[PDB]
Design a binder for this molecule. Structure first.
Ligand SMILES: [Mg+2]
Ligand SMILES: [Mg+2]
Ligand SMILES: [Mg+2]
Ligand SMILES: [Mg+2]
Ligand SMILES: [Mg+2]
Ligand SMILES: [Mg+2]
Ligand SMILES: [Mg+2]
Ligand SMILES: [Mg+2]
Ligand SMILES: [Mg+2]
Ligand SMILES: [Mg+2]
Ligand SMILES: [Mg+2]
Ligand SMILES: [Mg+2]
Ligand SMILES: [Mg+2]
Ligand SMILES: [Mg+2]
Ligand SMILES: [Mg+2]
Ligand SMILES: [Mg+2]
Ligand SMILES: [Mg+2]
Ligand SMILES: [Mg+2]
Ligand SMILES: [Mg+2]
Ligand SMILES: [Mg+2]
Ligand SMILES: [Mg+2]
Ligand SMILES: [Mg+2]
Ligand SMILES: [Mg+2]
Ligand SMILES: [Mg+2]
Ligand SMILES: [Mg+2]
Ligand SMILES: [Mg+2]
Ligand SMILES: [Mg+2]
Ligand SMILES: [Mg+2]
Ligand SMILES: [Mg+2]
Ligand SMILES: [Mg+2]
Ligand SMILES: [Mg+2]
Ligand SMILES: [Mg+2]
Ligand SMILES: [Mg+2]
Ligand SMILES: [Mg+2]
Ligand SMILES: [Mg+2]
Ligand SMILES: [Mg+2]
Ligand SMILES: [Mg+2]
Ligand SMILES: [Mg+2]
Ligand SMILES: [Mg+2]
Ligand SMILES: [Mg+2]
Ligand SMILES: [Mg+2]
Ligand SMILES: [Mg+2]
Ligand SMILES: [Mg+2]
Ligand SMILES: [Mg+2]
Ligand SMILES: [Mg+2]
Ligand SMILES: [Mg+2]
Ligand SMILES: [Mg+2]
Ligand SMILES: [Mg+2]
Ligand SMILES: [Mg+2]
Ligand SMILES: [Mg+2]
Ligand SMILES: [Mg+2]
Ligand SMILES: [Mg+2]
Ligand SMILES: [Mg+2]
Ligand SMILES: [Mg+2]
Ligand SMILES: [Mg+2]
Ligand SMILES: [Mg+2]
Ligand SMILES: [Mg+2]
Ligand SMILES: [Mg+2]
Ligand SMILES: [Mg+2]
Ligand SMILES: [Mg+2]
Ligand SMILES: [Mg+2]
Ligand SMILES: [Mg+2]
Ligand SMILES: [Mg+2]
Ligand SMILES: [Mg+2]
Ligand SMILES: [Mg+2]
Ligand SMILES: [Mg+2]
Ligand SMILES: [Mg+2]
Ligand SMILES: [Mg+2]
Ligand SMILES: [Mg+2]
Ligand SMILES: [Mg+2]
Ligand SMILES: [Mg+2]
Ligand SMILES: [Mg+2]
Ligand SMILES: [Mg+2]
Ligand SMILES: [Mg+2]
Ligand SMILES: [Mg+2]
Ligand SMILES: [Mg+2]
Ligand SMILES: [Zn+2]
Lengths: 110, 166, 140
RNA sequence: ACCAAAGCUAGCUCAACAACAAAUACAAAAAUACACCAAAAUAAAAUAAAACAUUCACCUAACAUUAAAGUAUAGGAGAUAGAAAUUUUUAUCCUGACGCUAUAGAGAUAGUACCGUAAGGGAAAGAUGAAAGAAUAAAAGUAAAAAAAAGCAAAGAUUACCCCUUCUACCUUUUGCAUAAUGGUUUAACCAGAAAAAAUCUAACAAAGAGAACUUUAGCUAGAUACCCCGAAACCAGACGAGCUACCCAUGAGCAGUUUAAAAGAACCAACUCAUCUAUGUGGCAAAAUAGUGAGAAGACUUGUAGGUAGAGGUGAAAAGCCUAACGAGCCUGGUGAUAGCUGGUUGUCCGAGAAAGAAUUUUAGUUCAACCUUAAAAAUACCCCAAAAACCCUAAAUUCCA
RNA sequence: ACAAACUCCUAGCCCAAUACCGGACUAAUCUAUUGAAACAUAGAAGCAAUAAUGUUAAUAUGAGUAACAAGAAGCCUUUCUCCUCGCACACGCUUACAUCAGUAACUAAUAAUAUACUGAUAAUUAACAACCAAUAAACCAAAACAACACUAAAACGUUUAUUAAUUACAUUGUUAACCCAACACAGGAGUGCACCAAGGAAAGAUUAAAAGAAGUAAAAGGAACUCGGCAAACACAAACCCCGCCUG
RNA sequence: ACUUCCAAUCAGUGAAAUUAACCUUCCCGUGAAGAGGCGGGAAUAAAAAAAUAAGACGAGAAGACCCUAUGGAGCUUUAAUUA
């Protein structure tokens, strides 16, 4: 089937300016209490999840160094340490990762 | 090419006579030859119109279209020039006055088909224009009430003449 | 000596002058414009002829309504107004019907009178009596 | 507001006048070893003759110019072709332009990109300023500014956009088109009537007129008035093509297993070759494919490199097959603005007057005569038309002809 | 009564039309004199496009539609999950190859980043391969694991004689992800060894409508379907005809 | 019945034939003889997305059929002229 006539710009304005083809205004946007950036109500904060992600990457690098090869992985629970910290007895007998950065405020001691 | 919009920042006004209304700052900004198409860019431009700059930034930020990152940078640039190069107190005081897309120049290429037929494929470019004005966003127009309509109707019944009659 | 047409701009402008208020693509493209403009002028001149019958229709209706109000139909009213030797336009008559209702009821009374005079004259079956409104004046 | 728009130059027309050095024909761009060299035979047809066979200017040569003359002649005596005898001509110097401005003018900024194996085809484009060793907002298409019962999209109008009321898009083509006949998305730039025999009109001089040759019983001499554009299939000459495919000639190379005394135009079944049948695909993944399924598979077998035969021909286990993604006869450049009684197109305004088919015709899709008609002129009667009058057996409406 | 282009009335510049044929004016150029800002008398012409499936350039509509692509997770090259036209040479392509750098936009039919875009710089090294004598004379005697044969009668040189510059090192090919199909084409491509030791990803993200494509399974029945048992089958077998003899 | 490619929604990039203008209904008449446009009636806020193919004598190819050009060509012979 081939179109029988060129459509007028009028008909096209009608079709493609329809309230359905318009982008809806998202009403669930808020600010995150920490960094004060924008985030959607049901989703994690992007900027927070970033610093979390970076730190996870680095701790995984150092614990990649503590492991000798590809298939070799620890049977103990792991506990990560920061400058100035010494292991509690609850946490001893476990694999320990030592890090230069003083323990970040959002990551707790527990 | 035509450059006009950019030059709309070069107008210098006569100084203010005493106690008149302070004419609010107008800032113009454009971005030429974006790799986006004109028609897609239009929807973004339509979305943010009339919004305060913070709401516009909010909307754009979470939107999916690849035009969103583009119009975002353009609004940030606009805001920075609004406080720096012109003088605007209170940088959140801006609202979007006019937002629009024009078509840029296009690239032309071959598109092969089958049985040795070819279509002519046009690589699309577009410009994005935005005018910001310092002040609180203008009020959105409320849908006509029955008290409005009845007033129109009466005003019309009362505008009649006896025609061809004198 | 090669010659080109330099002034083509004003040639087009002269036919687009008339094309501005049309809907769609006729108000831009010179073809569509030319045709729709010729159409427009033809109907212009036909309308000149029509509008005289339209206005006269309008008038006759208004005279009919005004006549109906006083309980007399249109043909009766007109004929009898004529048989009284009163020559009035239907334009002038319809205008009297609207802006001078008193005078117009005077007219309708006249016509009705003249008509009853007619019935009485023709049914009476004698040649002698001239109803006061049945006399016919020759001008001097 | 975008996209766009504007310059005046590069150069063209037409006419007068008259970086070596080395390397190269080995498979050009490779210093160097035994050969050979070198060659020539009418131009044809398209087309005119309304067909087509004899015939058809120009197309090779120089001979020019004014005449003799479109004359003598030559011609299916048709179409058309066409002399000479004899006559005329003062020097150079004195260059330019009622020639084009970037869709023009050269094809050209180029024979380059690119397209072809090859002969061969063959483009597009530039724009500020003294200085960049200073940084108009006017085409279509869109945006600013989605859309509210109804109907060729307008017009008459209205206080008022609609609402009312009135109207079968435009060309072409036909007896007749709203037609559901053809054409066109829209904008810009380009894109189609040329001739002077006879005639009419305006002037010169006139028994003559023309700046030579001629014509003259009012004529001569001068001016002015005139006749399109795009399309075949074809045909003829000369080139270039066998890296595809047809068939050969060289020189190479493959064919495992299984069965059988066997390499036997034998079996079975891979690689390899074909293309049966179905479904997908149909501007595809592909200008012939993919998936399944099939035939053959030591032979008239497949396949590599390199030669050969060329269009009035080649090749053919004849399908009128194939000969470079159209073969009842290749492709290219010439002839070539081939020729179309056949379509299709043909551009400002306004006024006068205005046509319907009797003949012949390879004629009936066309022409050429008559009749009607248009534009000028000269004149005298024109239509209408009462008696009277026009055939012999019967024969209506009515004709013909005239004050 | 209402109803026309008919006919009155009031004013005029005072009565329709295709083919063809007469008239009057004028748009835009250029040239003669005037004119000076748009000019008016003449003379001239490439002298006026709403229509040729017109030509070129540019824009729309169909349409943001058809269609296109990147296996997962991480510590960023490390494991996994799956499929198998792999490495050389010949021919042919010409820097597309290598390193570092840049990617707003150009190439990739998208991104990320880069063997394919841009710039700068580099690079394949001869023993392999190309180039590389003549003339006389003897020699009937196949390749086929070659004993010996077969019919279709089979490619290929040794040795003797006569002369052959005699002297380190000549010259040239050496990359690649590649070539012929307009494409960074589900296609066409010779040979030697390989079946992986080598190569590679069928899904951009979802959702699980119809209709289409491909595949799997099916109660009872088993050709009742339809031109035909075509396609498909847990079948794979038999028989009869016509036409050609047969492989081709 | 169920899987996979398509599929529909989100994000990139982005073609094709076609198109007088369309503000683009139905019925029965009419009409160049089969109407969305004419006549007489009906019906009728406005726009999207998804489907189906009855119509638009739908789209593609200036019909390969037929006939007509004082158009072509190939083939065959006792066509007519003949190297
Ligand atoms: Mg396009
Ligand atoms: Mg000129
Ligand atoms: Mg009148
Ligand atoms: Mg002829
Ligand atoms: Mg002829
Ligand atoms: Mg003929
Ligand atoms: Mg000749
Ligand atoms: Mg040029
Ligand atoms: Mg080439
Ligand atoms: Mg415009
Ligand atoms: Mg209406
Ligand atoms: Mg009609
Ligand atoms: Mg037409
Ligand atoms: Mg007809
Ligand atoms: Mg019809
Ligand atoms: Mg038709
Ligand atoms: Mg026709
Ligand atoms: Mg059409
Ligand atoms: Mg003459
Ligand atoms: Mg005379
Ligand atoms: Mg001939
Ligand atoms: Mg002929
Ligand atoms: Mg050869
Ligand atoms: Mg060959
Ligand atoms: Mg074997
Ligand atoms: Mg066999
Ligand atoms: Mg199957
Ligand atoms: Mg077999
Ligand atoms: Mg067999
Ligand atoms: Mg053969
Ligand atoms: Mg045969
Ligand atoms: Mg045959
Ligand atoms: Mg061919
Ligand atoms: Mg012609
Ligand atoms: Mg005859
Ligand atoms: Mg004819
Ligand atoms: Mg008489
Ligand atoms: Mg009247
Ligand atoms: Mg007339
Ligand atoms: Mg012209
Ligand atoms: Mg035009
Ligand atoms: Mg067409
Ligand atoms: Mg046109
Ligand atoms: Mg579009
Ligand atoms: Mg669609
Ligand atoms: Mg899709
Ligand atoms: Mg993939
Ligand atoms: Mg090689
Ligand atoms: Mg890209
Ligand atoms: Mg070589
Ligand atoms: Mg080589
Ligand atoms: Mg190599
Ligand atoms: Mg191809
Ligand atoms: Mg996908
Ligand atoms: Mg389904
Ligand atoms: Mg199924
Ligand atoms: Mg099954
Ligand atoms: Mg079953
Ligand atoms: Mg059956
Ligand atoms: Mg049955
Ligand atoms: Mg049966
Ligand atoms: Mg079967
Ligand atoms: Mg039988
Ligand atoms: Mg057989
Ligand atoms: Mg065999
Ligand atoms: Mg999308
Ligand atoms: Mg509608
Ligand atoms: Mg009828
Ligand atoms: Mg009907
Ligand atoms: Mg869809
Ligand atoms: Mg349909
Ligand atoms: Mg229609
Ligand atoms: Mg049909
Ligand atoms: Mg035809
Ligand atoms: Mg014929
Ligand atoms: Mg003939
Ligand atoms: Zn946060």
């Amino acid at each position: 089937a081939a179109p029988k006539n060129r459509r007028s710009i009028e008909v096209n304005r009608c079709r493609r300016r329809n309230p359905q083809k318009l982008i809806k205004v998202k009403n669930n946007i808020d600010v995150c209490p920490e960094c004060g950036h924008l985030k959607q109500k049901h989703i994690l904060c992007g900027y927070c999840y970033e610093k979390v992600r970076k730190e996870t990457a680095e701790i995984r690098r150092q614990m990649g160094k503590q492991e000798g090869g590809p298939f070799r992985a620890p049977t103990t629970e792991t506990v990560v340490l920061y400058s100035g910290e010494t292991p509690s007895e609850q946490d001893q007998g476990k694999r320990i990762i030592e890090r230069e950065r003083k323990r970040p405020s959002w990551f707790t001691q527990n | 090419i035509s450059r006009k919009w950019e030059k709309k920042n070069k107008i210098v006004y006569p100084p203010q006579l005493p106690g008149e209304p302070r004419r609010p700052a107008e800032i113009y900004h454009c971005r030429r030859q974006i790799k986006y198409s004109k028609d897609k860019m239009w929807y973004l431009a339509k979305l943010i119109r009339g919004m305060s700059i913070d709401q516009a930034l909010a909307q754009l930020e979470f939107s999916d279209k690849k035009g969103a990152q583009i119009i975002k940078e353009v609004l940030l640039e606009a805001q920075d020039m609004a406080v720096r190069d012109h003088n605007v107190e209170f940088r959140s005081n801006l609202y979007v006055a006019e937002s629009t897309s024009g078509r840029g120049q296009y690239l032309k290429r071959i598109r092969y088909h089958g049985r040795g037929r070819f279509g002519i494929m046009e690589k699309v470019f577009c410009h994005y224009f935005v005018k910001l004005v310092e002040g609180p966003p203008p009020p959105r127009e409320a849908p006509k009430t029955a008290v409005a309509h009845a007033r129109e109707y009466i005003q019309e019944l009362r505008n009649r003449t006896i025609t061809h009659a004198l | 000596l090669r010659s080109r047409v330099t002034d083509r701009y004003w040639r087009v402008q002269e036919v687009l002058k008339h094309a501005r208020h049309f809907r769609g693509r006729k108000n831009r493209c010179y073809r569509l414009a030319v045709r729709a403009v010729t159409r427009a002028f033809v109907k212009c001149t036909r309308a000149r002829r029509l509008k005289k019958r339209s206005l006269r229709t309008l008038w006759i209706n208004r005279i009919t309504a005004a006549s109906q109000e006083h309980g007399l139909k249109y043909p009766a009213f007109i004929i009898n107004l004529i048989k009284c030797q009163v020559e009035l336009n239907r334009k002038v008559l319809a205008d009297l019907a609207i802006y001078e209702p008193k005078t117009f009821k005077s007219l309708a009374a006249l016509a009705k009178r003249r008509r009853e005079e007619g019935f009485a004259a023709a049914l009476g079956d004698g040649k002698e009596p001239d109803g006061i409104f049945s006399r016919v004046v020759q001008h001097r």
